């Protein structure tokens, strides 16, 4: 259903080539053939508006195969040849001027602008739109093409012949948005400075580096979401306001008008955390943003995250001791189900709170039901809003601790039902609500730097080297559990009762896989002979082979992802501080920074960073002399050559 797309694009590219050879002028245009174009164009029946497989005329083929000598012949003979965009569901809009631009150099682009060209031509088709699709996204307009091909001579040549530097796209992207999401970042910086130079202070109401796209997102916030570390350092140099330089000690003054968490406008820290593309987390190690999060965490972020780590921990103990002291009543009838299959000797009270001890629990039980609703009023309005399970593909897949705490407050309000309607199976929802309840104490272990990168590693084993193990465990313990069952099916299950029921035979074979029971042995009755063989094979490929290989998987992984977890932990401090800043009122959380009213700098908030910069006379000697006009080493050097032939031979 979707792989016909890859075929149908490749159907057109061959059909384009076939129309070239079965045409006199197109084959003449694919090569130079300057003798042949003068031969053909003096005729009458020659369709110079010949539509190929996409809409191509002779000038497009002269341009795409860059025949400038064949281009001069066609412009003399056909007047409406700078016009006529292509038609097919692929390349649309694209005239001969675009193709002369994209090839990084032509004399045709000086020639076509002389022949009244068309620079508003929106090249909008299915081959100029960014997606996991077409390998390039250059833009729509001819200036957007000339920008992102590194053409410094052509962009100066376009604006002189009446261009448009501001015009957006179908996506809403301007010219300067396209320069940011190119894969050649340092040549994008030189084109960034050039395209602002020809703005010439337009009166166009926030001139061109503040204008948002259809998402609503400035060029400064597009270096941040996409992952442009090169552009983000370049765009920051307009923000800083450097105060003084006392020798080797500077004092810059950054502008937190778009970085810091503002009001209802979605700030830049709220857009990185809610985004994929792992290079976006590289922005959180940058000189205004690293110092902002650390000053929002040491001061107001950590002491509030411990006062929520202690209210919740006194909430679970209030919920635990209402399960320990739950009501039980002795067994009524008299052991009616037969012997050796019944040992329960209590049961659960219908409704009995009539003693002074139960009213103490009635205080405690009402706390954990009120607290259960509060959990479902601060997070369920995100699943009330952003979808139930079909439109809600974001927070289930993103945060693991979202699921465990909605499940906790669901199991309490199952027990609220069963206590009131007087059901029987209450030992089951309190079995979930305790293990789910105490394992959200693992959530409040991310502010402590000791325990922080350890809970990162546990969720990378569960969704990693343990479900790579649990499939080839369930293969083995469905084979052998059906093998141990059929052997002990013809035996006596009263001196060895590990296998007398196929739900039970799954349970003992799973424990012998983990060696968390001993093993079937009697030493008074001569066992079946096949058991001594099939348990001996099961002892090798469980205890000696597959479990010690699982130590080798978790031991190989843990030194490979060992600096990623310190990148993942410091990105969960940002995810915590942003969340704590939102849900808490402004009366407890002061806005970070220093205001500009009383210091006379405006309405924008500032942040001062001072840094003892550097030395290295040797570096600055090399550049100022241009200006000046008229052993562990043996261990390290061994590691270079192991990289050296490791690189040049690949």
């Amino acid at each position: 259903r979707r792989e016909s797309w890859a075929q149908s694009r490749d159907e057109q590219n061959l059909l384009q080539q076939k129309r070239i050879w079965e045409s006199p002028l197109l084959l003449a245009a694919k090569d130079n053939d300057v003798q042949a174009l003068n031969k053909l164009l003096k005729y009458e029946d020659c369709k110079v508006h010949q539509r190929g497989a996409m809409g191509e005329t002779a000038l497009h083929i002269a341009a795409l195969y860059d025949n400038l000598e064949a281009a001069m012949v066609l412009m003399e003979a056909a007047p409406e040849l700078v016009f006529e965009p292509m038609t097919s569901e692929l390349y649309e809009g694209q005239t001969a001027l675009h193709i002369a631009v994209v090839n990084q150099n032509m004399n045709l682009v000086r020639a076509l602008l002389a022949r009244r060209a068309s620079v508003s031509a929106r090249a909008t088709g299915t081959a100029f739109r960014r997606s996991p699709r077409n390998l390039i996204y250059f833009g729509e307009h001819p200036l957007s093409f000339a920008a992102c091909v590194n053409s410094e001579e052509i962009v100066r040549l376009l604006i002189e012949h009446g261009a448009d530097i501001r015009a957006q796209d179908s996506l809403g992207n301007t010219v300067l948005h396209i320069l940011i999401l190119q894969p050649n970042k340092t040549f994008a910086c030189q084109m960034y400075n050039l395209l602002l130079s020809y703005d010439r202070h337009g009166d166009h109401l926030q001139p061109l580096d503040l204008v948002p796209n259809h998402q609503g997102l400035t060029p400064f916030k597009l270096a941040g979401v996409e992952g442009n570390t090169v552009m983000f350092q370049h765009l920051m140099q307009k923000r800083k306001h450097t105060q003084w330089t006392y020798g080797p000690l500077t004092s810059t003054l950054y502008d937190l008008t778009e970085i810091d968490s503002s009001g209802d406008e979605q700030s830049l820290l709220e857009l990185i955390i809610t985004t994929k593309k792992r290079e976006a987390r590289q922005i959180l190690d940058q000189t205004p943003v690293k110092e902002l999060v650390s000053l929002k965490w040491k001061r107001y972020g950590r002491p509030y995250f411990c006062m929520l780590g202690a209210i919740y921990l006194l909430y679970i103990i209030c919920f635990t001791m209402c399960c320990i002291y739950r009501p039980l009543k002795p067994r009524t009838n008299n052991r009616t189900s037969p012997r050796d299959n019944t040992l329960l000797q209590q049961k659960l009270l219908q409704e009995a709170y009539v003693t002074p001890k139960d009213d103490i629990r009635l205080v405690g039980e009402l706390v954990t039901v009120i607290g259960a609703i509060i959990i479902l009023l601060v997070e369920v309005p995100d699943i009330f809003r952003m979808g139930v399970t079909r439109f809600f593909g974001q927070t289930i897949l993103g945060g693991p601790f979202h699921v465990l705490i909605i499940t906790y407050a669901f199991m309490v309000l199952v027990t609220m039902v069963m206590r009131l309607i007087s059901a029987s199976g209450e030992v089951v929802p309190m079995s979930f609500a305790l293990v789910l309840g105490w394992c959200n104490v693992m959530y409040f272990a991310r502010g402590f730097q000791m325990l922080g990168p350890f809970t990162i590693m546990i969720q990378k084993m569960i969704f990693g080297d343990l479900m790579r193990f649990c499939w080839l465990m369930a293969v083995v313990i469905l084979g052998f559990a059906s093998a141990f069952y059929i052997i002990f099916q013809t035996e006596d299950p009263e001196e060895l009762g590990h296998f007398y029921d196929y739900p039970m035979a799954l349970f003992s074979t799973f424990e012998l896989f983990l060696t968390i029971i001993d093993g079937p042995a009697n030493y008074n009755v001569d066992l079946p002979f096949m058991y001594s063989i099939t348990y001996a094979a099961f002892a090798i490929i469980a205890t000696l082979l597959m479990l010690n290989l699982l130590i080798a998987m978790m031991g190989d992984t843990h030194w490979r992802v060992a600096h990623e977890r310190d990148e993942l932990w410091r990105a969960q401090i940002v995810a915590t501080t942003v969340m704590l800043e939102r849900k808490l009122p402004r009366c407890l959380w002061p806005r970070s920074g220093i205001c500009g009213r009383e210091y006379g700098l405006g309405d924008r908030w500032f942040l001062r960073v001072e840094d003892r910069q550097d030395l290295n006379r040797q570096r600055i000697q090399r550049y100022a002399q241009a200006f000046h006009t008229r052993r562990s080493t043996s261990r390290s050097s061994a590691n270079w050559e192991r990289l050296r032939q490791g690189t040049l031979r690949r």
Binding site: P183, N184, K185, T186, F187, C189, Q190, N193, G227, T229, V230, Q237, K240, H241, T242, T245, T250, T252, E279, Q282, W559, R560, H563, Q613, D614, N616, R617, Q618, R619, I620, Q621, R622, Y623, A624, A626, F627, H628, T629, R630, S632, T633, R635, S636, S637, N639, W640, R642, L643, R644, G646, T647, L648
Partner: protein, 148 residues
């Protein structure tokens, strides 16, 4: 300057950064004299006027970065490398900035197995680094991959 690759421009832009001590893209005659005094030698305030008006093609007295970049083509270092090495650096350099990092060499060693500790990775850079920043240039990387 018609041949400059992404590497030398990413080196010259950082070289423009520490030389400029007011954050914008304009080199004044005064802030050129700030660096010159830190070299021990003294200016004469006409030598500062000499070096600015040598190449100030627009005519503003403030050296912009395109006029800084074509200036380092006049005082060029050299162009002599191999096409496989320049491709090999762009594989190593993740965030396209013309520099390899301490976390960008622990990635390359991890793909080759090699079981490196954090201490030897900082000891690799001390034999790679020339100017003394703890950050390998492109010229520092070419000097190691064929010479020593």
């Amino acid at each position: 300057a018609d041949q400059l690759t992404e590497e030398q421009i990413a080196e010259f832009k950082e070289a423009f950064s520490l030389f400029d001590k007011d954050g914008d893209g304009t080199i004044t005659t005064k802030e050129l004299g700030t660096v010159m005094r830190s070299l021990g030698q003294n200016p004469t305030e006409a030598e500062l006027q000499d070096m600015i008006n040598e190449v100030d093609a627009d005519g503003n007295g403030t050296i912009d970065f395109p006029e800084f970049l074509t200036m380092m083509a006049r005082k060029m270092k050299d162009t002599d490398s191999e096409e496989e090495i320049r491709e090999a650096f762009r594989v190593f350099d993740k965030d396209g900035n013309g520099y390899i990092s301490a976390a960008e060499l622990r990635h390359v060693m991890t793909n080759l197995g090699e079981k490196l500790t954090d201490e030897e990775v900082d000891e690799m850079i001390r034999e790679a680094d020339i100017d003394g920043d703890g950050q390998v240039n492109y010229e520092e990387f070419v000097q190691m991959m064929t010479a020593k």
